[model samples]
Target chain A: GNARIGKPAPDFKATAVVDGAFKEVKLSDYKGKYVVLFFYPLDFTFVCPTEIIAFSNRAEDFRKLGCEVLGVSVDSQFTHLAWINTPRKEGGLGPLNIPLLADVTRRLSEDYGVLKTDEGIAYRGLFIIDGKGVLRQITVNDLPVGRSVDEALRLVQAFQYTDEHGEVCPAGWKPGSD
Target chain B: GNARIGKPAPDFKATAVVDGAFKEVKLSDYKGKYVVLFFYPLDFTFVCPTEIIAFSNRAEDFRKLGCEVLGVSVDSQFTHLAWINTPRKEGGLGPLNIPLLADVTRRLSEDYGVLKTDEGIAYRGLFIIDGKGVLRQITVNDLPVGRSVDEALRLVQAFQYTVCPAGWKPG
Candidate 1:
């Protein structure tokens, strides 16, 4: 079964570019911190880095909100880094602030039920886990479209705002939505 | 040939008891990350839970240094969760943040060459994989002897320090 909201986010550890260095990251380590864990299809592919770079650009925004941003893909870490070296116009992200995790075995995609299974890659998936490690929100987009980091950040803040204020967000809620 | 210092860590995917839930984990997911992957004999046994629980206690310290700790065994994930529910007084670990991977298929054990094929359980084998997924360090102990978490952490720190610079000792 897919990971249901209100359940514990499935834990995983993967190689990631942490602090500009390759390092291991575990889902459990993010306990007590909001996590914007999202997944894409592959490295050096179309539509993936557009989202990847956008998220990386706004990683500080998420961190300032007491959230950690993590990106996942089915490609190897080597290729992931390579894509980071290219210029944006040439379809390469020069550098990234957040960690991009490799999911070559594709187990994480399957665990989250976002894997295309047929294409051997994952659909664009977004998971907002709370500080207590519970899954607060989940979103999956088809392979063709990229995700909105603006929307993702809004969701994280919206969730945290609710947890802090005990008020539910109304439709099209932003941070302070009544 | 088996996994040497220069080769890639064996790839695998299996069910794991991660923070009290059964989920699938993949070795390849750990690429570009430092991994201190170790294997134990079985659950609810002597000298095994001691090491497992000890590492779980220091799991955060490892994470702080940019390394991930993973425990593996031939037991099923159900058994792994049950053991986690057991109290340490009765020789069961209560909870741990680290993932205890199930080698019920025995493929990872075999690929890592830690399997006591005759006994059908893994030895106290430890592998240190670098961020690029290269096997950098390997150690194994007899089933009775527990490995050192301090030593493992030191090695990872030392390697990272060495990679970033050269000819200097770590603080």
Candidate 2:
């Protein structure tokens, strides 16, 4: 599987824990809609909660832009749910509005070129797939490093703005501003 | 030139315009400290100023971590200084404390794997090198995107914390 930009995203069908229920999700189901697909190292670990909760807190903003956020890891759905049920004060992220997909077989992680086989963990990877399923933006950070939610939101906004207006965003370009 | 991480950073000596004067800086000068080197698209253009100014505004924070920040582009040194003199409200980054290196030949841009040869401009490329000059982190964003200053600061802090203490910022 090639993980290059401007290419079609890899398709996946898996059982994900979505809002406290186990259901099947296919990447194809998100066709014709923007999708924010991110991968973290694992559940019950550091640096993961900060990013997951940050994105979950801003879920509505992404939804407003016609995007659905999906987080994936090699952990099982049960573990994901357990971690989600764990309180933040105890170092576990409580229930979240987003779906945490299980990639236990490591196929999806390898497909995304994010699995560090030697370390048995995935790097901090985020992929912004457009409505047409073409990847427009991709960012990867080391496992110990966390990602920025505001920057991700700004990027989605920028992509949507450019696609709609056919004009380029200048430096310091924010939504509703020149 | 290879961009393999964990290797020694490539050395460069350039005369950059810093605070109204031409100063000669080299990669060797930053030895024994971390360096945050980034390349933007162009001066007096869109999308570049936000990143430049954001990094400039947070230079002190990076300096506190024993790291130096360097901004580079294909724009001339004079243009860089002029843009530095221009105020933010007027779309210019006024008075940056760091040196803005000029890569007119695009050599450094290409070496950093950010130069868009077809477009004649470099993407937003950022590299974090450690005290030994070993490249630790490298990120390149599309030209239309602006990087996060706070995130960069957090990352620097995270790296420092992790190296100095076990799982410092991980949890």
Highest TM-score model number: 1
Q: Candidate 2 residues B48-137, lDDT tens each?
A: 467777887889889989989998876546456656655677556778887899765456777778887755467888888888988888
Residue lDDT tens for model 1, B1-171: 276897888887888989878899887887777999998876655444567777899999998888899999876565577567656675568888899997755678888988876555788999999888888899887758675788998999988998367787868
Candidate 1 C-alpha lDDT tens digits along A1-178: 4688899999887877665467888988999999988887655433435667777788889889989989887665644564565456645567789888877556788788888764556778889899999998888766533357888888888888787889854798677667
DockQ for all models: 0.02, 0.01
Give the docking tier of candidate 2: incorrect
A31-59 per-residue lDDT for model 2 (tens digits): 98898889987665434467788888888
Residue pairs with backbone overlap in model 1: A23-B33, A86-A92, B32-B131
Q: How accurate locally, in lDDT, is each candidate?
A: 0.78, 0.76
The list of candidate 2 runs beyond 4 A from truth reads A143-147, A169-178, B1-171
